[PDB]
């Protein structure tokens, strides 16, 4: 009966790996070259995952592309937290298997505060008793959670489609939690969780772009496609031309 939820699980990506020299003593330059590799791989995986989404083929192929490029980091950060939650129970950061982040790597990467934030969201998963089905469904909602204020090439469709993903999230909660101030209690937190992802993303958007600019001066390598997105679409978000849709203000 869970037609929507079959799909989401059915289309779930594999455990992507970075290919990081775990035998080499840590260094900013080494660390961030694997995280850029990681980004670039996961991006591909996001692309294929996203195209299978129910009603995604509905969007105009530019919107299809745009929502991917805009929402791409937040998705990486969401799933990531679930990975560190379910693999390392939230003690470290399960980026990929070959790239798990301890405290000293967190600091050595120069994204410490930013990771502080992400280990929190990892902790949120447990604290809030997030279900696997609750995760997947929140995860899907996130591709539809960041519009350009400029206007999408076909907004109407996007809006219909988004409004539906919320129904589906409702339905996942309203299922086994039969009660008024329960479904209500839950949704709040979940939307309150989903919103909290955005600040993390924009921070990583700032670090990335920054690193990208000063990359000539650090020995850190941006994949052909990493670096186009970070230059072409990220500055849109950072310049405020693209904003996240928030549940609360």
């Amino acid at each position: 009966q869970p037609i929507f939820l079959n799909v989401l699980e059915a289309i779930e990506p594999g455990v992507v790996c970075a290919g990081h020299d775990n035998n080499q003593p840590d260094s900013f330059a080494a660390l961030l070259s694997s995280l850029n590799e990681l980004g670039e791989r996961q991006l591909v995986h996001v692309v294929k995952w996203a195209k299978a989404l129910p009603g995604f083929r509905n969007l105009h192929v530019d919107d299809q592309m745009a929502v991917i490029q805009y929402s791409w980091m937040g998705l990486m950060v969401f799933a990531m937290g679930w990975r560190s939650f379910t693999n390392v129970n939230s003690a470290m950061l399960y980026f990929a298997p070959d790239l798990v982040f301890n405290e000293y790597r967190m600091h050595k990467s120069r994204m410490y505060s930013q990771c502080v934030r992400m280990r929190h969201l990892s902790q949120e998963f447990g604290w809030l008793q997030i279900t696997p089905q609750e995760f997947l469904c929140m995860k899907a909602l996130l591709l539809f959670s960041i519009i350009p204020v400029d206007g999408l090439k076909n907004q109407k469709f996007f809006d219909e489609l988004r409004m539906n993903y919320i129904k589906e999230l409702d339905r996942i909660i309203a299922c086994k939690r039969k009660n008024p101030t329960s479904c209500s209690r839950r949704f709040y937190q979940l939307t309150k969780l989903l919103d909290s992802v955005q600040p993390i993303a924009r921070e990583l958007h700032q670090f990335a772009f920054d690193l990208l600019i000063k990359s000539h001066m650090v020995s850190v390598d941006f994949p052909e496609m990493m670096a186009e997105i970070i230059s072409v679409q990220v500055p849109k978000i950072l310049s405020g031309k693209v904003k996240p849709i928030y549940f609360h203000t």
């Binding site: 692309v47 192929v61 299809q64 592309m65 991917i68 490029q69 052909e224 496609m225 186009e228 997105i229 072409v232």
Partner: peptide, 8 residues
């Protein structure tokens, strides 16, 4: 772009 042309 590089994304748009890998995408389609």
């Amino acid at each position: 772009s590089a994304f748009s042309r890998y995408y389609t």
